[PDB]
Amino acid sequence: MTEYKLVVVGAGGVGKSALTIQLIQNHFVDEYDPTIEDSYRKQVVIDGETCLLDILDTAGQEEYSAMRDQYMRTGEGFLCVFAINNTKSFEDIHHYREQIKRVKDSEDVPMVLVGNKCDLPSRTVDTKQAQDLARSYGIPFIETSAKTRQGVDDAFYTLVREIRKHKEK
Template sequence: MAAGCRDGPGQEKYRLVVVGGGGVGKSALTIQFIQSYFVTDYDPTIEDSYTKQCVIDERAARLDILDTAGQEEFGAMREQYMRTGEGFLLVFSVTDRGSFEEIYKFQRQILRVKDRDEFPMILVGNKADLDHQRQVTQEEGQQLARQLKVTYMEASAKIRLNVDQAFHELVRVIRYDNLSPDNQCPYING
C-alpha cells in the first residue's frame, strides 16, 4: 500500500505549513486533502489547523497541518508558524502571476527564520484546472522550483488533482532532510 490513511500507534508526526498569497487556494487544498471536499466560497483564513492520520510509503504518519493567512495584514503571525513548521507547501495560483512572484518572499522568510540555506518545501501551482485563465506556465513553475531547489507540482483542489500527492511528497522531503548528516544529533562520548 503506497499511500492511504488510517490510525495507528507509533506513527511519525509532522508539522506541515501551507503558505502563499491570498486567494490562491491554500484552504481549498487543505480541506480537500483532509475532508475530500471542495470549498466553493472564499472566506479568508486567519489560521486553521487540521490533523490527518496517513500511511505514506508504508509508514504511519500523523500530519498536523497549519493553513495560514495569505493576507499581508496577518504577516506578523507568519514568523511564529515558520519557527514551528517542519515542512512547507509554497502555494501560488497558476491564474495569478502576482501570487507566483510572491513565492520568493515566503521562501526567503522561511530560510531566514530557520537560519538554513535549504529547508523541506515543495512548490505547488494550484488551480491547474483553470487552463483558460492561466498566467503562469508549467515551465515557469518548474524553473522557479529549480531556482529554489524544491519539487514542483501542479494541483487542483477542485478536481482533486495532485492534492494528496503534494502533502505526501512534502512528508517524503522532510524524511529525506531528517536523514541528512547535518541534522543528526552528534554522539557525545562521555
C-alpha cells in the first residue's frame, strides 16, 4: 500500500474543506470552520493500485511561516482550487504556483488547476482564462463543484496520476 501525500492549497473561501470532505464523508457540508486545518485519509484502488491518500485541508494562515512551508515540501501533489465567481482567488494562482515552486526548489511540481463553484452563477472567471493559465504551467484544469461533486472525483484522481507521472519521469 503506497501513501500519497497531497495538499489542497488556495485562497480562503474557495471550498477547500468542502471539496475534500465530500469524498471523505460522502456529503456536502454547507457550513464548516474555515480556520480548521485537518488531515483526512482515504484508501482507493486507483489504476489497480491500492494506495492511501493523505490530504490536508489548509486554513490559510498558520502560527509560523516555517510550519506552513513544512507541508509545502512534503507535499507530492498540490490541488490548486479557485472560485470561478471570485477572480481575486484566480489571480492568486500565480503567487501559489510560484511560491510552492520556490519552497520545493523545482520547476516540475505536480499540480492540478481546479475551478470550484461551477454550479453557481455570476461567473467572472471564464473557463478559457483558467485553461489558458493551466496550459502555460503545463498542468490539467477541470471545473468542479463541491455541491454536485462534479469534476471533483476526476480532479483528485488526476492529481494522483500527476504525482505518479512526476515520479516516473
